[PDB]
């Protein structure tokens, strides 16, 4: 099945796929590239771009006097291991497309590209690159600048539903050294104790529930180690991260894990933390979701089960707006060899995106 | 303070230290290098090389009719890290010597060298190229021999002291996969789990108890997995060993910490096992160790504590023979960038043997 915002939508999208903004390195420009194709692309739209630095980039467009914005980030994840052909290049089969991107999150911007070009309807647009991570600057700037919106709808891989919740992120790089002062003088065997210790209270936090969404998701990441079987390791390195449920205590979790270290670990650095969503007094969440739903329900928009991955909605919802989770695919296929999304959701997407901007 | 005896040790070991047999690679010829410059230095002897492949050689040399066996391994561990200068260029200072291997072990070959150097007292040398590694093979194909010999002292650094016991070693290679059918889906996860019950395992043996030695050395030496903090770890490897005292049963041993990973680890293998010295049931570790006293004291050799680390006494002790390790030299520089032992160490030790070959 095809229709003709599906296709400018693909012809978008091929365009927006073949432009590298992978993050790292984030080598991404404010002249040239992916903007320049973008400011090109936004008739009747007053646009634009600021450099944050450092390949942090916005482009902020405004057509009319539009009461909702959505935010669509750019840059896509590192490309493989695995891909069977160029990550660049999009391709496509009878019922889908793939390429590095095409499901988080550029078929959301391709599809509201096409749609800025089909009507002349009233939309705003906030075009980010540094959402996947960490020294982030694009959202923290626009805040900063007090525009209002009665709602801020932020695209990721939600199978074309509104997503109303969501889990918080943490991540930290913990690093164990021996203490030849005994027990600790190993510092895998202090890893070994600390894990083991981690894990056990995360079981205790398992009854924890939210919108469907129960426990803490906990993971420890990496360990690195040692050298030899019997030759006692003096230094471990090990990256954990969580992702909190709403209204959970992040400050206390954090301090709690760095605790169950004995002795101290040697370093314990949280480099990335982002709110869930909402945030808050389980109150202030409930009042903010139940806000959230209702202007997904002025928007037609079906609401879908609340999500464990995180997003910038987080930060729209901190800031004091009323704020979502909405674009077409499946987080299942993020980050993945062969990335894809269905011409389905991309149709079903930029009809709905199409249907908010310029429907009657 | 130098002796005649000295010189000629400090020369031979200044020629033997020369000689690269880093063990990896374990690059070591039967013919040339180190093995031709003992064949040159033995007179008197009936001498013999066996090459048994793959850098595993022995040279076995008998002059008269000795009741001792006298055996020293020729290899050493690599090199670095740290090392200030050349390896193999023996260094000297006002009290002691630099080099790759002269302090394990050598020092000791050096030594009984010189001896054989000094008189036509009996005598019974095996050098062997294969201790510090994996796949030895001399001293195996040695004992297939059954040739008689009332004790035979195993060259490692025990300050000149006797040493009649010490602990048996294993070594372990595990992989834990993660299980996507959950709990288990997290390979780091296990290996966090097995690692807090091994742990506990071994404290539960801490009061066991063998000539001073106390509980189980036991040692998780590397662990690497997973790629990122909060990717979930398909596999991880963890490397760990554990050295038995006497009479402890290695085999239940090993299967208690098999058993502690639940679901069963992807990959167990016990990449080696020596037995501790003596070796078998308590009763016979205790006849064997006074023996092997007996035979210290005949020979005039102050007894030293029993060690923690590992030495082929073992191997020629569980094959029937009275066995005891004795070298110059402290346990302590042993693998170490600029390892040294002193020439205080050296003269003890072969004045020591001297006497045990050449005097009256």
Same mark, same amino acid.
């Given at each position: 099945?095809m229709?003709? *915002?599906?296709?400018? #939508?693909?012809?978008?999208l ?7 903004? %992978?993050?790292?390195?984030?080598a991404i ?8 194709y973008? @400011?090109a ?6 646009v634009?771009?600021?450099?944050? =630095?450092?390949?942090?980039v916005?482009?902020?467009?405004? @057509?009319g #006097? ?14 493989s ?8 290049v999009? %391709?496509?089969?009878?019922? %889908?497309?793939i390429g590095?991107?095409?499901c988080?999150?550029? =078929? ?7 749609? !800025? ?19 982030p ?8 600048r ?6 801020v709808?932020? !695209?990721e891989? #939600? ?21 030849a ?7 895998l065997?202090?890893?070994? &104790? ?7 209270h ?8 939210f ?5 803490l998701r906990?993971?420890?990441? &990496?360990?690195?180690?040692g050298?030899?079987?019997?030759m ?6 090990? @990256?954990?991260?969580?992702?909190? *449920? ?5 400050? =206390? ?5 760095? $605790?169950? !270290? ?11 933390r ?5 945030? $808050?007094?389980?109150?202030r969440?409930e009042? &903010?979701? *139940?806000?959230? &739903?209702?202007? !997904? ?13 995180? #997003? ?6 901190? $800031?004091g707006?009323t ?11 993020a980050?993945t060899?062969?990335?894809?999304v269905? *011409? ?7 009809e709905?995106?199409? @249907?908010?901007i310029? $429907?009657?």
């Amino acid at each position: 099945h095809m229709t003709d *915002l599906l296709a400018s #939508t693909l012809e978008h999208l091929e365009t927006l796929v073949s432009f590298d903004t %992978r993050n790292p390195p984030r080598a991404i420009a404010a002249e040239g590239g992916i903007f320049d194709y973008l @400011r090109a692309q936004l008739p009747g739209f007053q646009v634009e771009v600021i450099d944050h =630095g450092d390949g942090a980039v916005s482009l902020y467009a405004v @057509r009319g #006097t539009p009461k909702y914005l959505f935010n669509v980030h750019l840059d896509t994840v590192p490309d493989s291991p695995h891909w069977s052909a160029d990550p660049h290049v999009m %391709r496509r089969t009878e019922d %889908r497309v793939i390429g590095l991107g095409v499901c988080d999150i550029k =078929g959301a911007a391709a599809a509201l590209v096409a749609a !800025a070009n089909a009507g002349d309807g009233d939309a705003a647009f906030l075009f980010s690159s540094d959402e996947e991570a960490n020294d982030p600057r694009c959202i923290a700037a626009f805040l900063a600048r007090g525009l209002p919106y009665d709602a801020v709808l932020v !695209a990721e891989p #939600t199978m074309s539903e509104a997503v109303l919740a969501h889990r918080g992120i943490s991540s930290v790089l913990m690093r164990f050294a021996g203490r030849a002062g005994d027990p600790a003088a190993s510092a895998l065997h202090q890893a070994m &104790r600390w894990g083991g210790k981690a894990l056990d209270h995360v079981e205790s936090l398992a009854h924890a529930r939210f919108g469907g969404l129960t426990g803490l998701r906990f993971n420890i990441g &990496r360990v690195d180690g040692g050298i030899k079987a019997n030759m006692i390791a003096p230094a471990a390195e090990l @990256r954990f991260g969580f992702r909190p *449920l709403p209204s959970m205590d992040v400050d =206390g979790l954090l301090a709690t894990f760095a $605790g169950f !270290a004995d002795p101290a670990a040697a370093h314990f650095e949280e480099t990335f933390r982002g709110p869930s969503l909402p945030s $808050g007094d389980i109150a202030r969440a409930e009042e &903010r979701r *139940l806000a959230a &739903r209702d202007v !997904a329900d002025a928007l037609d928009l079906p609401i879908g089960n609340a999500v464990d991955f995180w #997003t910038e909605a987080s930060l729209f919802s901190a $800031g004091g707006y009323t704020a979502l989770v909405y674009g077409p695919g499946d987080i299942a296929q993020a980050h993945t060899a062969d990335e894809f999304v269905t *011409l389905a959701q991309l149709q079903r997407y930029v009809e709905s995106v199409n @249907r908010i901007i310029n $429907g009657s």
